Structures are given as C-alpha cells and as structure tokens.
Amino acid sequence: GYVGGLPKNVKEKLLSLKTLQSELFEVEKEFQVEMFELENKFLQKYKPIWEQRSRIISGQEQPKPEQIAKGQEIVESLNETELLVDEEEKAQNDSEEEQVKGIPSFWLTALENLPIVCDTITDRDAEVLEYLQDIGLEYLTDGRPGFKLLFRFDSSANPFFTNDILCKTYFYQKELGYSGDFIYDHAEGCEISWKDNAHNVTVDLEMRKQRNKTTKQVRTIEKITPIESFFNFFDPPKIQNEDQDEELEEDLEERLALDYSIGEQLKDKLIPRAVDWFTGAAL
Amino acid sequence: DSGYVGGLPKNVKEKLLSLKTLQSELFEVEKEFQVEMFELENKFLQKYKPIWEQRSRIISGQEQPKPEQIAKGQEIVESLNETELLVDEEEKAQNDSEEEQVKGIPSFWLTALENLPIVCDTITDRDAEVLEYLQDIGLEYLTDGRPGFKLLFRFDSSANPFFTNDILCKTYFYQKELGYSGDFIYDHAEGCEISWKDNAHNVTVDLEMRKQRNKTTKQVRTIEKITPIESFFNFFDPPKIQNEDQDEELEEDLEERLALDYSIGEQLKDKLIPRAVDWFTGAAL
Numbered sequence: 001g002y003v004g005g006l007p008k009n010v011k012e013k014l015l016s017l018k019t020l021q022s023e024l025f026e027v028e029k030e031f032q033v034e035m036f037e038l039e040n041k042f043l044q045k046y047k048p049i050w051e052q053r054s055r056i057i058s059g060q061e062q063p064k065p066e067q068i069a070k071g072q073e074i075v076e077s078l079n080e081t082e083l084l085v086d087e088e089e090k091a092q093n094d095s096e097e098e099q100v101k102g103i104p105s106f107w108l109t110a111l112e113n114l115p116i117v118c119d120t121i122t123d124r125d126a127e128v129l130e131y132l133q134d135i136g137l138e139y140l141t142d143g144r145p146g147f148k149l150l151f152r153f154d155s156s157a158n159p160f161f162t163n164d165i166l167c168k169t170y171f172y173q174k175e176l177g178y179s180g181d182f183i184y185d186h187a188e189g190c191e192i193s194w195k196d197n198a199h200n201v202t203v204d205l206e207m208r209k210q211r212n213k214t215t216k217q218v219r220t221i222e223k224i225t226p227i228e229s230f231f232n233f234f235d236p237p238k239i240q241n242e243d244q245d246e247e248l249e250e251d252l253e254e255r256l257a258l259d260y261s262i263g264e265q266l267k268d269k270l271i272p273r274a275v276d277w278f279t280g281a282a283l
Numbered sequence: 284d285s286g287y288v289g290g291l292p293k294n295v296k297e298k299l300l301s302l303k304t305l306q307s308e309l310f311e312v313e314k315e316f317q318v319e320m321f322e323l324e325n326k327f328l329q330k331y332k333p334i335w336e337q338r339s340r341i342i343s344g345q346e347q348p349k350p351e352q353i354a355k356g357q358e359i360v361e362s363l364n365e366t367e368l369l370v371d372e373e374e375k376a377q378n379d380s381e382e383e384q385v386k387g388i389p390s391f392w393l394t395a396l397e398n399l400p401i402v403c404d405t406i407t408d409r410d411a412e413v414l415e416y417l418q419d420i421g422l423e424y425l426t427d428g429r430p431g432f433k434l435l436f437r438f439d440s441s442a443n444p445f446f447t448n449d450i451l452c453k454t455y456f457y458q459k460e461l462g463y464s465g466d467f468i469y470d471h472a473e474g475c476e477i478s479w480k481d482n483a484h485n486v487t488v489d490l491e492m493r494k495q496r497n498k499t500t501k502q503v504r505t506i507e508k509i510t511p512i513e514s515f516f517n518f519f520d521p522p523k524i525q526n527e528d529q530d531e532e533l534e535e536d537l538e539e540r541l542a543l544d545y546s547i548g549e550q551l552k553d554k555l556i557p558r559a560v561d562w563f564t565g566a567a568l
Contacts, residue, residue: 004367008374009382015356016348017560063301071300089293097294275302
C-alpha cells in the first residue's frame with residue numbers, strides 16, 4: 001500500500017518488476033513444456049517395466065533364475081526376509097505350483113494395502129478386481145495438459161462386463177497455476193458395459209414378477225439402483241462448473257478432491273511402487 | 284499378513300523376487316530422470332539469471348525503468364488487480380531530484396523474507412539489522428562436486444557495520460542415492476564462518492565481561508565469556524556429528540535441526556526467489 005503511496009520512482013520500479021514477472025512467466029511456460037517433454041521421455045522408459053510386471057502378475061510371462069537371484073540379494077539387503085524361500089516350500093511339486101498362472105489377487109492385495117483406495121473396495125469389487133490384469137498410465141499431449149489412467153481386464157473370462165480396457169482421464173487448466181505448478185481441470189471417464197445387472201457391481205438388483213393390480217397386465221421386472229464401489233472411480237464428476245450441475249457440482253467438487261487424491265496416489269505410489277504395496281512392505 | 288506370505292508357493296515367491304528386481308531397475312531409471320531434471324533446471328536457472336539480475340538492479344536503484352517496461356507493467360496492472368502501481372497525478376508532479384534521495388527499494392529483501400512463512404520465524408531483530416543491508420538473494424546449483432544447492436546473500440562491506448564479507452552463502456547437500464519416493468534426500472549441511480568486524484556487533488552470540496582480584500587464585504585477571512543464542516544467522520554453522528556424542532545427543536539434534544533446516548532451505552529455493560516480487564508485496568501468499 002504505502003509502496004504505492006511512495007513516490008512514482010517506487011511505483012515505476014514496481015511496474016518494471018511486474019513486466020519482468022510476465023517475462024519470467026513466459027520463461028516458466030517454456031520450462032513447464034520442457035519438463036513435460038522430459039517426463040514423457042522417461043515415462044516411455046517406465047512403461048516397459050510396468051507392462052513386464054503386469055505380464056508376470058497375470059501369469060502371461062515367467063521369471064528367470066537371474067532375476068530371482070537378484071531379488072534374493074535385494075531382499076536380503078532390504079531385510080524383508082519374509083519373501084525368502086524355505087525347503088518346505090521347495091517340496092511343492094510343479095503340478096501344485098501351476099494350478100494358478102498369475103499371482104492370486106495381486107492388484108486386489110496391493111490396492112487393499114494402499115491407504116485410501118482400499119476403503120473403496122467392496123466384496124463384489126474384490127471379486128471383480130481378481131480379473132484386473134494391469135494398470136497403465138499415459139500423458140495427454142494435445143490441448144489441455146493432463147494424464148490418463150488405464151486398466152486391463154481379462155474380459156474373456158470376466159463375467160461382469162465386456163470392457164476389455166477402461167480408461168480414465170484428467171485435465172489441467174490452460175495456464176500455469178500460481179506457484180509454478182499445474183492445477184486440476186475436471187475429469188472424464190468411460191462407461192462400463194455390464195453383462196447384466198446382477199453382475200453389475202456398481203448396482204444392487206431386484207427381480208419382480210407381477211400382475212398389475214390396476215391394469216391386470218402380466219409383467220416381469222428387472223430393476224436397478226446404483227451403489228458405491230471401486231468402479232465409481234469411473235463415471236467421474238461430470239464438469240468443473242456449469243449452470244445446470246450446481247446442485248451436482250457440490251458432490252462433483254467433493255468427489256473431485258477425493259478422486260484427484262486417488263489418482264495422485266495411483267500415479268506416484270502404486271504404478272511406480274507395486275511390489276512393496278502388494279507385500280505390505282510399503283506400509 | 285505373514286500367514287498369507289508363507290502361503291505363497293515357491294513359484295509365487297520367485298515371481299515376487301523378480302518383481303522386486305524390476306522395482307530396483309525402476310529406481311535406477313528414477314536416478315537417471317533426476318539427473319536429467321537437475322541439468323535442465325540448471326539451464327533454466329541460467330535463463331532466469333538475466334531477469335533476476337535486472338530486477339535486482341531495479342531494487343537497488345542502480346537502474347531506472349524504461350517507458351516501454353513502464354507501459355508493459357501498466358498493462359499487467361490493468362490485468363487482475365495491481366492498481367497500487369498505477370501512477371497518479373500527484374506523483375508525476377514530483378522530480379527525480381526529490382525522489383532519488385532514496386535510491387533503491389528500502390528493506391526489499393528483509394520484507395520478502397518476513398512474509399515467507401517458515402523462515403520468518405527464525406529472523407530476530409538482531410538478524411533483521413543485517414538484512415536491511417541485504418540487496419540480493421541468489422541461487423546456485425552444485426553441479427560440480429557433491430549434488431545440492433547453495434544460497435547466496437549479498438552485502439556491502441563499505442556500508443554494513445557488522446562483517447567484512449560482501450557475500451554470505453548457505454549450502455545444502457543430498458545423498459548419493461535417491462529417497463524411497465524417488466525424490467532427493469539429504470546429507471549434512473554446512474555454513475560459512477561469518478567474518479564479524481568485532482564480537483560486539485556479532486549477532487549469533489551474547490557476551491559478558493568481568494574483572495577480578497581473585498584471592499581464590501591470587502590472580503588480578505580479566506575474563507571473557509561467549510554464549511550462542513537463537514538467531515536466523517544460526518541458519519549458518521549448521522550441526523555436525525561426533526560419534527559417541529552423536530548417538531545420544533546428536534540423534535535428537537539431527538531429528539530436529541536438520542528437519543527445520545531442510546524445510547527452510549527448500550522453502551527459500553522454491554517459494555521465494557522465483558516470486559521475489561509477489562512475496563515482497565505479499566501477493567505470493
């Protein structure tokens with residue numbers, strides 16, 4: 001205030017500082033573009049590792065002796081001696097071992113250990129998550145900057161929906177939010193092609209067969225009511241803000257905070273750290 | 284669950300070991316990514332250097348704004364709300380001879396630090412007295428030698444009465460390996476020895492003097508005593524370790540002092556200097 005009340009030398013110097021602030025903001029925009037470029041570059045390196053562990057998880061690929069030995073040495077260095085093999089386990093025959101190809105409930109176990117997301121999982125969700133093979137992540141290059149999430153389900157054996165893959169998208173605002181980070185814009189996601197309502201874990205179901213007391217027509221009914229589930233992660237909050245959504249926008253904002261927290265958790269912890277979160281060592 | 288872990292078939296344990304190996308490879312990739320980020324950040328620090336130097340010249344009064352920069356600032360003021368800078372008729376009547384009697388921006392950096400939440404707690408009035416002579420706050424990235432960043436504080440020896448050092452700097456150091464989350468993690472920090480002009484001006488100590496005809500020792504003797512005290516300039520001379528005392532005393536020392544010190548260093552580096560102006564006016568809050 002008084003700095004404005006100070007002579008126009010001080011005001012004019014502040015004006016120059018603000019012009020330099022705008023120029024610095026331009027340099028900052030350049031830096032942000034550069035760091036997203038670098039992040040994409042190294043995400044291309046992340047993807048092979050994540051896909052490899054996903055193939056191991058689903059059982060689509062097998063380990064190798066050198067990898068097992070390296071993990072042995074690392075675990076001994078980690079002090080997490082629980083993973084260590086014992087002779088009683090060695091006694092198991094191959095016929096006993098191959099009864100399951102992938103790690104049972106790998107992701108479900110990992111998501112159960114993960115702090116916030118585990119609260120979202122219901123029993124039917126847990127059963128569904130058993131068919132979850134992989135979680136993949138991607139960055140949005142066009143238009144608004146943002147990052148996208150992918151899940152792969154073995155839809156062939158999945159009894160609940162035909163969606164081979166589900167994708168979830170996040171958006172950021174146009175300009176650099178203050179403090180030189182990117183702040184969120186609303187999110188969008190897929191809709192699930194449930195095979196039927198009984199198998200729809202986002203829904204609880206009622207069956208009714210009736211003869212209408214008013215018209216005396218004969219009818220059989222299939223009825224639906226939505227419920228909370230891990231897959232409420234999809235059907236994300238509709239819009240950041242719009243005139244018709246305001247009453248919805250209350251829930252959209254709250255669920256947006258929660259869903260951004262969930263996605264941030266996935267992005268930083270789970271997809272970059274899966275093994276420890278499965279084993280619980282990440283706790 | 285230990286029981287479930289035991290239940291894991293030997294094949295499943297082998298697969299888990301392979302997965303942990305993959306996680307280690309991921310940590311290696313994260314190391315490479317952090318190296319690239321550090322180098323790019325150094326490059327854009329080089330690009331920031333001109334603008335920061337120019338604003339420093341403006342702050343010190345060594346340079347005067349041009350009408351072009353003035354008009355651009357006026358436009359940016361018309362944007363959002365900064366009409367505090369819109370110059371009024373009463374000021375245009377003034378003359379540079381009257382205005383330039385105060386050259387530069389009084390207490391620009393001291394004001395900037397005080398608005399900064401965490402660090403301002405450490406600054407005392409005795410520290411503050413030095414900070415009016417602060418006219419620059421600079422960053423350096425320790426590309427050579429141990430990784431980390433160094434902070435630079437500048438003064439005028441001919442102006443300040445406290446020390447003969449034109450520049451005071453603080454340093455922070457990282458471990459050779461990344462943290463678990465993939466971010467950088469810390470090593471012991473170090474600070475400069477302040478070349479105080481005299482102990483009386485020195486602000487990291489409180490002193491007392493006595494004189495005794497000590498019959499207990501039959502000594503006509505003069506004595507001096509020095510006590511460390513709390514002050515922001517304790518931000519320099521950070522803690523160090525000695526093995527035996529380390530595990531009892533410096534364990535808690537490292538638990539507390541290092542946490543506060545790293546928090547303050549990162550807060551300066553990230554929040555303050557890139558927004559050196561908004562923090563001074565307070566808009567950066």
